[PDB]
Amino acid sequence: TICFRPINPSDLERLEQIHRDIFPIRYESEFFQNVVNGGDIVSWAAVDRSRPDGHSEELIGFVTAKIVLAKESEISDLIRYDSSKGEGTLVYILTLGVVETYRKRGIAKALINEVVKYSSGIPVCRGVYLHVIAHNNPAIRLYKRMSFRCVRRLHGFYLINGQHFDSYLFVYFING
Numbered sequence: 001t002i003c004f005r006p007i008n009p010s011d012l013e014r015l016e017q018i019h020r021d022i023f024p025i026r027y028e029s030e031f032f033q034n035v036v037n038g039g040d041i042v043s044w045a046a047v048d049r050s051r052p053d054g055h056s057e058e059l060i061g062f063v064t065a066k067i068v069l070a071k072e073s074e075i076s077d078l079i080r081y082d083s084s085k086g087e088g089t090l091v092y093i094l095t096l097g098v099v100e101t102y103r104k105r106g107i108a109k110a111l112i113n114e115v116v117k118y119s120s121g122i123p124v125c126r127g128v129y130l131h132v133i134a135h136n137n138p139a140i141r142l143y144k145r146m147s148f149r150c151v152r153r154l155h156g157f158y159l160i161n162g163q164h165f166d167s168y169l170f171v172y173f174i175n176g
């Protein structure tokens, strides 16, 4: 029933709308152009092509990520650098969401899996990291279930509705 494909420009309107509706961190319109145009942002859509009334190709889940030079990342302190391999990169998950009526079916887990499977194919890509809002227990349980390590708490990381919230840094290293 559920399939995964790269996000493309025809997803632009739906992508912006779903972020506004379910993703707490606000992004500017330029961000969504970056996502659908690719380049330094990789992303995946989840679709149910079995949906009635024409919306078969409309995404019902998404994950967006960007590529980060390992030595420019905030977790560079956690990495053992081997002089012979070069600096390497990291994949940083930016956003992740599933529409409410599709939740608790493993779609978010599968979306994260796509990002990890992607990062493992890039020669010197060292893994995946992200920040989770600290009071978002479902997200914490999800990344833990995917074997991500909860590293540390960052204070005042997020600004949401004019209120500051802490985040947790989560990392999955390909060779931990």
Ligand SMILES: CC(=O)SCCNC(=O)CCNC(=O)[C@H](O)C(C)(C)COP(=O)(O)OP(=O)(O)OC[C@H]1O[C@@H](n2cnc3c(N)ncnc32)[C@H](O)[C@@H]1OP(=O)(O)O
Binding pocket: 022, 023, 024, 094, 095, 096, 097, 098, 099, 102, 103, 104, 105, 106, 107, 108, 109, 110, 131, 132, 133, 136, 138, 139, 141, 142
């Ligand atoms: C930046 C951050 O803070 S991280 C990004 C967080 N994104 C958001 O908060 C956006 C709003 N939230 C969402 O969109 C969603 O709720 C998400 C992305 C957090 C999870 O989406 P889901 O597709 O529901 O994730 P998934 O289905 O893989 O697991 C969710 C729950 O369903 C459960 N589940 C999975 N498959 C099944 C199944 N077949 N039968 C029953 N329960 C199931 C999982 O065990 C989990 O249970 P828990 O809630 O007790 O941990």
